Paper text:
The protein that gives the process its name, Clathrin, is a triskelion composed of three heavy chains (Clathrin Heavy Chain, Chc) that provide the structural backbone of the lattice, further stabilized and regulated by three light chains (Clathrin Light Chain, Clc). The proximal domain specifically interacts with Clcs, whereas, the N-terminal domain (NTD) of Chc, which adopts a WD40 beta-propeller structure, is pivotal for interactions with various adaptor proteins (APs). All our structures show that each peptide binds to three different binding pockets (Clathrin, Arrestin and W-box).
Additionally, K98 interacts with position −2 of the motif as observed in the Ent5.1, Apl2.1 and Yap1801 complexes. Residue K284 within the W-box establishes salt bridges with the carboxy-terminal of Ent1, Ent2 and Yap1801. Concurrently, K326 forms hydrogen bonds with the peptide backbone at positions +2, +4 and +1 for the Ent5.1, Apl2.1 and Yap1801 complexes. Water-mediated interactions are also observed in the W-box between the NTD backbone (L24, D25 and V309) and the peptide at position +3, for both Ent1 and Ent2. However, Apl2.1 and Yap1801 do not show density compatible with water molecules near the binding sites. Interestingly, the substitution of the second Leu (LIDL) and/or the addition of non-negatively charged residues at the C-terminal of the CBM decreases the binding affinity. Specifically, the Leu/Ile substitution on Yap1802 retrieves a KDApp≅ 311 µM and the Leu/Met substitution on Yap1801 a KDApp≅ 598 µM.
Author numbering:
A (entry chain E), C (entry chain G): 1 to 7
B (entry chain A): -1 to 369
The structure:
């Protein structure tokens, strides 16, 4: 799974 | 700066110690604050618990009741109290109609709770995150599992649980000691994707912004503030979630420094609230500093000290257009922008015409007619 | 029933 957000 | 030129309005809503509240109950566990409508103080006297409900919307009227539980919160707007005993027995009552809305016993104790919306109460256990539709009419129905807690929240004190208006994005915040400082950890969860992400942060909130091109349809952003426990570096971040591909304008990620003065080594962010209407972020530190940021650009507008005594809790103020907090001396303090001075302040003190236009246009505020 | 709050 990708990050939900760029952080 | 002269008081008439401040870009904020400051108000002491009440001094709790003037109502006869003892300072031994002024702490995060005992004096709870879900909204600027009410403060609930759990008192113990000679072995017997009671609750004092302070109605900030009705001249600080105090309603006192004996109770058998040891933790209590009020609804954001209604005379609905939620009480638990030792994390397991939970009852929620409408104090007007006298009626019991929820009554159940949990096998796994609730260790933190917070209203997520006007309809939904959030619960965090040692292992799990749950929500209850408190007003669904099924009194004995237990909270529904949202997701398991992420391991990054292990060994934290849970201090907040927030959601978006659609109730499909969520954040749980915990703190722990690290490197002689307080570090913040956040579990972000997308219900639609059934995925969590662990991030560093002390504060979090979901909000909405109307951008040029997007008509009256808002885009959603997640706002978070952090102070790195190793480096001491403070950072606010604002990031889009769930971009509607039908809308022409997207929210470009913004990052801004959170200023900490040299002698504030052990300070950190304790709360963040947002005015959707005006596009203003209010970030409060434990030591009592308020920081304002504009939502579209992330620009830091203003920093000031609203209290010298430490803040232990905070909530939205004035229909979520500002922020309120409670300090260790029992003062309930509120900040919102001055609608008459904010644009002149940006124009004259910050000398930022573009930002003045943004704020004036979004909020329909005076001071920008000659630009 | 147990009631946690004395109404």
């Amino acid at each position: 799974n990708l990050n939900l957000i760029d952080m | 700066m002269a008081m008439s030129d401040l870009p904020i309005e400051f108000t002491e809503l009440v001094d709790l110690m003037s109502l006869g509240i003892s300072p031994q109950f002024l702490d995060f566990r005992s004096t709870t604050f879900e909204s600027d409508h009410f403060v609930t103080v759990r008192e113990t006297k000679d072995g017997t618990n009671s609750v004092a409900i302070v109605d900030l919307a009705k001249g600080n009227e105090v309603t006192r009741k004996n109770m058998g539980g040891d933790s209590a919160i009020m609804h954001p707007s209604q005379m609905v109290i939620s009480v638990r005993a030792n994390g397991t027995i939970v009852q929620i009552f409408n104090l007007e109609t006298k009626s019991k809305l929820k009554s159940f016993t949990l096998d796994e104790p609730v260790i933190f709770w917070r209203w997520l919306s006007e309809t939904t109460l959030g619960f965090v256990t040692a292992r799990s995150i749950l929500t209850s539709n408190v007003f669904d009419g099924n009194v004995n129905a237990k909270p529904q599992l949202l997701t398991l807690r992420h391991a990054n929240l292990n060994n934290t004190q849970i201090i907040n649980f927030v959601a978006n208006k659609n109730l499909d994005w969520f954040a749980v915040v915990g703190i722990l000691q690290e490197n002689g400082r307080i570090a913040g950890r956040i579990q972000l969860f997308s219900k639609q994707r059934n995925i969590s992400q662990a991030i560093d942060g002390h504060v979090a909130i979901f909000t909405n912004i109307l951008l040029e091109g997007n008509g009256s349809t808002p885009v959603q952003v997640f706002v978070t503030g952090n102070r790195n426990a190793t480096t001491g570096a403070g950072e606010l971040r604002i990031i889009e979630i769930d971009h509607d591909a039908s809308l022409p304008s997207q929210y470009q990620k913004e990052t801004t420094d959170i200023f900490f003065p040299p002698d504030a080594t052990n300070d950190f962010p304790i709360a963040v609230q947002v005015s959707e209407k005006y596009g203003i972020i209010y970030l409060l530190t434990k030591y009592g500093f308020i920081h304002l940021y504009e939502l579209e650009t992330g620009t830091n507008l203003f920093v000031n000290r609203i209290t010298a005594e430490s803040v232990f809790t905070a909530a939205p103020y004035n229909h979520e257009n500002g922020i309120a907090c409670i300090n260790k001396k029992g003062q309930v303090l509120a900040v919102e922008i001055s609608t008459s001075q904010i644009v002149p302040y940006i124009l004259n003190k910050l000398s930022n015409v573009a930002l003045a236009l943004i704020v004036a246009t979004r909020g329909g505020l005076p001071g920008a007619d000659d630009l």
